[PDB]
Amino acid sequence: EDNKQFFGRHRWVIYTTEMNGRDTFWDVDGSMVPPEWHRWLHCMTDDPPTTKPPTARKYIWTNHKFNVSGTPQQYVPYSTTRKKIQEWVPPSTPYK
Amino acid sequence: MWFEILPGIAVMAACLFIPGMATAHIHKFTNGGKEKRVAHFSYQWNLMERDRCISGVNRYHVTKGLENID
Amino acid sequence: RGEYVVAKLDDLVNWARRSSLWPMTFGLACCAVEMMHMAAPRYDMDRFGVVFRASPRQSDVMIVAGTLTNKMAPALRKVYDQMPEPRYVVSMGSCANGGGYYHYSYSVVRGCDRIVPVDIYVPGCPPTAEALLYGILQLQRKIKREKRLRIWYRR
Amino acid sequence: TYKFVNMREPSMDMKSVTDRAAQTLLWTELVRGLGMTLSYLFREPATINYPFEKGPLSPRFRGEHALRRYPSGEERCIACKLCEAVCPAQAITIEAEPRADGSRRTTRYDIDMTKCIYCGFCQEACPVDAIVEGPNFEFSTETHEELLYNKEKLLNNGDKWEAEIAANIQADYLYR
Amino acid sequence: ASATRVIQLLRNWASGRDLQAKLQLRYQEISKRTQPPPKLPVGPSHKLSNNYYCT
Amino acid sequence: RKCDPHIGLLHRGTEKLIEYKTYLQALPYFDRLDYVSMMCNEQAYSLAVEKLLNIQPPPRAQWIRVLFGEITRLLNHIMAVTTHALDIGAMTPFFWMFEEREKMFEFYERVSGARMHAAYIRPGGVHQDLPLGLLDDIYEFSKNFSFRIDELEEMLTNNRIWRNRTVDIGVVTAEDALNYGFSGVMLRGSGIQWDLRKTQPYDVYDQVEFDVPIGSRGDCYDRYLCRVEEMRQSLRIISQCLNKMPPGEIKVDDAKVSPPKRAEMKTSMESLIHHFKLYTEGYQVPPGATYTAIEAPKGEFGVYLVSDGSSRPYRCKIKAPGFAHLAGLDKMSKGHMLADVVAIIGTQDIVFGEVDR
Amino acid sequence: MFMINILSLIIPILLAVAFLTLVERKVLGYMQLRKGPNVVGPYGLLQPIADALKLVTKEPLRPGTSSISMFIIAPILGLSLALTMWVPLPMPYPLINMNLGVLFMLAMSSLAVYSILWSGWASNSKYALIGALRAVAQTISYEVTLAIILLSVLLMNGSYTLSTLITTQEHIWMIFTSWPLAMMWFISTLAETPFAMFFMAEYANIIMMNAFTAILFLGASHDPHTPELYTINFVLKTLALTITFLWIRASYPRFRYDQLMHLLWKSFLPLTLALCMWHISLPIMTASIPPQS
Numbered sequence A: 001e002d003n004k005q006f007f008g009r010h011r012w013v014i015y016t017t018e019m020n021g022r023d024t025f026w027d028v029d030g031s032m033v034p035p036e037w038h039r040w041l042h043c044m045t046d047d048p049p050t051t052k053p054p055t056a057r058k059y060i061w062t063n064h065k066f067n068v069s070g071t072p073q074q075y076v077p078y079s080t081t082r083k084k085i086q087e088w089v090p091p092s093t094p095y096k
Numbered sequence B: 001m002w003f004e005i006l007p008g009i010a011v012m013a014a015c016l017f018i019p020g021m022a023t024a025h026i027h028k029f030t031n032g033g034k035e036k037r038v039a040h041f042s043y044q045w046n047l048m049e050r051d052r053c054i055s056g057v058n059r060y061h062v063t064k065g066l067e068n069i070d
Numbered sequence C: 001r002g003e004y005v006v007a008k009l010d011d012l013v014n015w016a017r018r019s020s021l022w023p024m025t026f027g028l029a030c031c032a033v034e035m036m037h038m039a040a041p042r043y044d045m046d047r048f049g050v051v052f053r054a055s056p057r058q059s060d061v062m063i064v065a066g067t068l069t070n071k072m073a074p075a076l077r078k079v080y081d082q083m084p085e086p087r088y089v090v091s092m093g094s095c096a097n098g099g100g101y102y103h104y105s106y107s108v109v110r111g112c113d114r115i116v117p118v119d120i121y122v123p124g125c126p127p128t129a130e131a132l133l134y135g136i137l138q139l140q141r142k143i144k145r146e147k148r149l150r151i152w153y154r155r
Numbered sequence D: 001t002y003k004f005v006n007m008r009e010p011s012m013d014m015k016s017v018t019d020r021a022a023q024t025l026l027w028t029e030l031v032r033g034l035g036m037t038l039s040y041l042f043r044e045p046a047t048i049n050y051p052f053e054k055g056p057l058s059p060r061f062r063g064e065h066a067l068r069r070y071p072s073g074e075e076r077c078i079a080c081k082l083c084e085a086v087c088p089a090q091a092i093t094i095e096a097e098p099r100a101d102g103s104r105r106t107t108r109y110d111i112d113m114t115k116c117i118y119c120g121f122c123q124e125a126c127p128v129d130a131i132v133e134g135p136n137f138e139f140s141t142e143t144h145e146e147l148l149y150n151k152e153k154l155l156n157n158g159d160k161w162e163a164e165i166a167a168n169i170q171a172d173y174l175y176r
Numbered sequence E: 001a002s003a004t005r006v007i008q009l010l011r012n013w014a015s016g017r018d019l020q021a022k023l024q025l026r027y028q029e030i031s032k033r034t035q036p037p038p039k040l041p042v043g044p045s046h047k048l049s050n051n052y053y054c055t
Numbered sequence F: 001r002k003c004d005p006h007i008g009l010l011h012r013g014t015e016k017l018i019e020y021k022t023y024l025q026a027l028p029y030f031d032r033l034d035y036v037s038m039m040c041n042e043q044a045y046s047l048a049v050e051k052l053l054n055i056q057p058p059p060r061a062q063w064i065r066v067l068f069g070e071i072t073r074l075l076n077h078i079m080a081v082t083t084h085a086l087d088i089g090a091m092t093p094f095f096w097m098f099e100e101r102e103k104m105f106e107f108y109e110r111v112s113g114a115r116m117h118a119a120y121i122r123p124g125g126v127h128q129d130l131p132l133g134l135l136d137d138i139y140e141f142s143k144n145f146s147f148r149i150d151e152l153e154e155m156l157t158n159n160r161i162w163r164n165r166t167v168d169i170g171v172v173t174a175e176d177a178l179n180y181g182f183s184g185v186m187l188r189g190s191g192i193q194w195d196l197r198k199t200q201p202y203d204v205y206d207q208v209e210f211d212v213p214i215g216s217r218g219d220c221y222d223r224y225l226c227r228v229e230e231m232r233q234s235l236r237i238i239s240q241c242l243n244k245m246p247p248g249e250i251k252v253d254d255a256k257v258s259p260p261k262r263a264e265m266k267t268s269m270e271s272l273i274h275h276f277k278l279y280t281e282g283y284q285v286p287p288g289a290t291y292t293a294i295e296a297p298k299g300e301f302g303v304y305l306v307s308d309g310s311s312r313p314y315r316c317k318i319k320a321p322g323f324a325h326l327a328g329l330d331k332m333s334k335g336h337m338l339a340d341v342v343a344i345i346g347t348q349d350i351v352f353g354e355v356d357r
Numbered sequence G: 001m002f003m004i005n006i007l008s009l010i011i012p013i014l015l016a017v018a019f020l021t022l023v024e025r026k027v028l029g030y031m032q033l034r035k036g037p038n039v040v041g042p043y044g045l046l047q048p049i050a051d052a053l054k055l056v057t058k059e060p061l062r063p064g065t066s067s068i069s070m071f072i073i074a075p076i077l078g079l080s081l082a083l084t085m086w087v088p089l090p091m092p093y094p095l096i097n098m099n100l101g102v103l104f105m106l107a108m109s110s111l112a113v114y115s116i117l118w119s120g121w122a123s124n125s126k127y128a129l130i131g132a133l134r135a136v137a138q139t140i141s142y143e144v145t146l147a148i149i150l151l152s153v154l155l156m157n158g159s160y161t162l163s164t165l166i167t168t169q170e171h172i173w174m175i176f177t178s179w180p181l182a183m184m185w186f187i188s189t190l191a192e193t194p195f196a197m198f199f200m201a202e203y204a205n206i207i208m209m210n211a212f213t214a215i216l217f218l219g220a221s222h223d224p225h226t227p228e229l230y231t232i233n234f235v236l237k238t239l240a241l242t243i244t245f246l247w248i249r250a251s252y253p254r255f256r257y258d259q260l261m262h263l264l265w266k267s268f269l270p271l272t273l274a275l276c277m278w279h280i281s282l283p284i285m286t287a288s289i290p291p292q293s
């Protein structure tokens, strides 16, 4: 955090070396920033989580994940609804 | 900041500097001290050939002063 | 071991290929003028080093930005043909990605995918400058993880 | 009220013509161009380092969407279908069902992320603040299928982006 | 701002204009990014009497 | 000798899908129409719809419309001149000014929440309020904006190469221009004393002081001068606007056209019902046929909207200023050398977004 | 070891050709509030390596309607020329002290027009044909101003021997006697200047033109014993000129062709003739004719 730097460059970062089983020493992306600090870093507010942490809730992820595209952990879409027009069940018997 | 240009210009300045320094130093070396004698006219050239002939070692830059003559 | 050498030569080659792209920009719609906003000083898409125009033959990545109508359909495909390998295209914006706000229109192909293969899908209407610059960084990392020379030695 | 933009005439006195002849013979207005950019050269750049720091945003920012849930953990969506009706690109497709408990919420919620236009009508349409766009913008992909969202992915983002959504909507519910 | 006096008088002279009076980028002149809570006003029909929508 | 342009390379069925979306859903199309200026297009569509609705916006909305209408004028005019600058060369003014557009994009970001396609101006006013402290930053940027524009003039006004490449190169006479349906800079560049803000002041433009930079000759240099003096004559408008910003509600107090406040929605039922119906089918515009045009930053943008009497527009035809401008490309590119055509479209100010519809 | 001296020139010039590009982009960058290449290596030091090896790995596509023979020898000449006029430069002591160095510089630098002419013809495209036609006529128009300026400059020098230039200047920079010609000369140098090659060819021309302008107009003192004094002065002068060469690259709208010919044949050529007339009689006028030997 700084005030001497101009607007948009006053708050900044360097990234960690390990990020959820992924070495980060040369490559960098913008998605490792956790949501609690994603507000502070993007100059969307002025109260860092150290000064003002987010309200704790159960469904909130305890481990933020970065962007996952290009890895074996991708996203794959699929139908969320249920099967309709269900195939008529045929009986067997021997025969007539 | 504006002074980050200098690392860019410095290396090529050395890249431009090397041809000049190398040419001057090799001139001092292959001519052994005295710089490469320049012969823009046939007078200077036949002077050089006289120096090469008089040296006795077929090296124009070898010079024989007062110690040579009797 | 030859496997180690082919790995080092792989790393040496693509490090350039992940640091010296040249984008042939296809200025179509509001996503296109938004790109030039990225090349503006506020974001400096030239500091990584990819020139804003880059010309047709002097280009690596073709950023498809804007609505892709069938009017421009054959012109882009002929352009993509002329783009020398290695060539990648980054579909920018909802219109170029799947059709966006004109998906059901009669005079636009639904998505730039149906015309050319795409390496990076950056979403937005328009995508914010860094949101596409990050996509460029995503393409940058996508170049890091290629096994070109490694596959050749494996074969 | 109108103002002329080119009606000035050059005076033909010796001083003015000397100015003109001096202007063109030995270029000065062009040298003034050199001086201006030289001052620009000896000036700080305005180029931020991505992703080490990025340009400022606002609490009203509309980006990647995410369904939310009540403090109890119960989902906010009630399948009122307002968002689908207003969705200008018809990127919302939802199907409701009488859930076994009796709250009867949605079964399907697919946002066609490559059809959406980030207009923000969906969030204002929702009467229970269920669908909101998170401040994220770096969610690009290499596959078209990744962009096509669904109920599970939407719920996951709400579980992921929750500090920002709660805080941004807390800084904005008085505004809208 | 940062930039010393020597660089300053170079950029003022080369431009011929006092650039330090106002910069093209903001150091500290902006509103604090978070804001105190607001109170929105009301309009001509937030009354309970003689506001029949018919007229 | 031939200057017939092949256009439609951008064409989308804008009017066709407008016919099937409701008025509220129809709004974002105009933001996407001109891909150089976003918000001033919303002014045209909104002004038409309220006129048919016989509903006027509150005075608070009117001043916000003109304030963002002017910042759009700066936005379009920065892009128009800088892109003009780029195609000739001269990349430095293109970069220097585009830094300032980032400030105004952040201004758009602070109000609408989106960078470009604000969708902020709606029939009945502006949907969201002005965030606290927003106008101060407008004052900050506007104070420094004039200084930047002199830097543009200092590099550009007296530059002989630019001037010579833009004096008398491309010229249209008064009657040919005005007969060709020209508008915006070209009628003013040719010397015609016409401007929609002064002759037919819409919204709140009557209560503001400015001048219309017209010029003689009619070539593109004066058109370049016309835009630049519009920048300054714009800057005085924002200076008066943020000096005289009145207090009031952002949208009309008519719930049938303006969705109620979120607090009202979750408390009072008629707010819930009206918002429900406003967000299922919306307001029903009474039948009519109005062509309302406004002084768009690049020209005269108009919409001819016929209303079926239901919650959807029967047909809405967009008067794209560049569509008439590009139609005269033959006239303003007659005789000049080939290298000057790109300059002509540079001063013709054609954005493919609206000419190709 | 004379061969080693050639590599001690060609390669560093080749690297010098390689490495001022980062100077260009960062100067052009920092000029427009930008930063230039600074993420690849420290301050873009490795940016030139980031592009060159990428370029050599890129397949060189060849047009279907392209004559391969001309398409590959035109760069051969283009690079051969661009690294040949570096040889007679009087930098400390020149590699070749040709008594007619100025003539050799002009004849071989005027030969560069063949490369662009062949490239347009061999490419066989409507764009390439006119672009070659425009480039060559712009170029072939501008040796007449080049030759006259250099000719009229050399009246007060003494000969075409490039090494003699140092002796002529010595006391003062030669611009102070021909500053109307310096602006006459400098402007003309701007316009006169496979695809992987064409970066190298014109680019060495850019630096050497400024190196040529450096010795011609802004000389230095060459101490017979210590040569490093002339080395630093020569490099510093040719750097300042090149920075100016890119200073104007992003400071003016580019010239248009009809003005480009009009500027020379109607406002540059007639004035160049007058200055040549002024500088042919003035050595006679003041009895200051110089010695050739």
Ligand SMILES: CCCCCCCCCCCCCCCCCC(=O)OC[C@H](COP(=O)([O-])OCC[N+](C)(C)C)OC(=O)CCCCCCCCCCCCCCCCC
Residues within 6 Å of the ligand: D024, D025, D026, D027, D030, D031, D034, F160, G179, G180, G181, G182, G183, G184, G186, G187, G217, G248, G252, G263, G266, G267, G268, G271, G278
């Ligand atoms: C006793 C004295 C004897 C000698 C006296 C000599 C005469 C007096 C002085 C005459 C003027 C100065 C000398 C000639 C200069 C050029 C004359 C000319 O034609 O000018 C008008 C010319 C043409 O101007 P024009 O085209 O607008 O007008 C010319 C006149 N008509 C209209 C009739 C055609 O100017 C140019 O060409 C503009 C510059 C073009 C190049 C763009 C880049 C410029 C970069 C400038 C900065 C860098 C300078 C570097 C200098 C060298 C450094 C080492």
Ligand code: SF4
Residues within 6 Å of the ligand: C029, C030, C031, C065, C066, C067, C092, C093, C094, C095, C096, C100, C101, C124, C125, C126, C127, D117, F032
């Ligand atoms: S995705 Fe949105 S911003 Fe991009 S071109 Fe399409 S409509 Fe325009």
Ligand code: SF4
Residues within 6 Å of the ligand: D083, D086, D087, D088, D089, D090, D091, D092, D111, D115, D116, D117, D118, D119, D120, D121, D122, D123
């Ligand atoms: S923002 Fe996207 S999802 Fe929401 S209503 Fe608009 S188009 Fe539909």
Ligand code: SF4
Residues within 6 Å of the ligand: D076, D077, D078, D079, D080, D081, D082, D083, D084, D094, D125, D126, D127, D128, D129, D130, D131
């Ligand atoms: S997200 Fe909101 S508007 Fe959409 S169906 Fe659920 S409750 Fe209704």
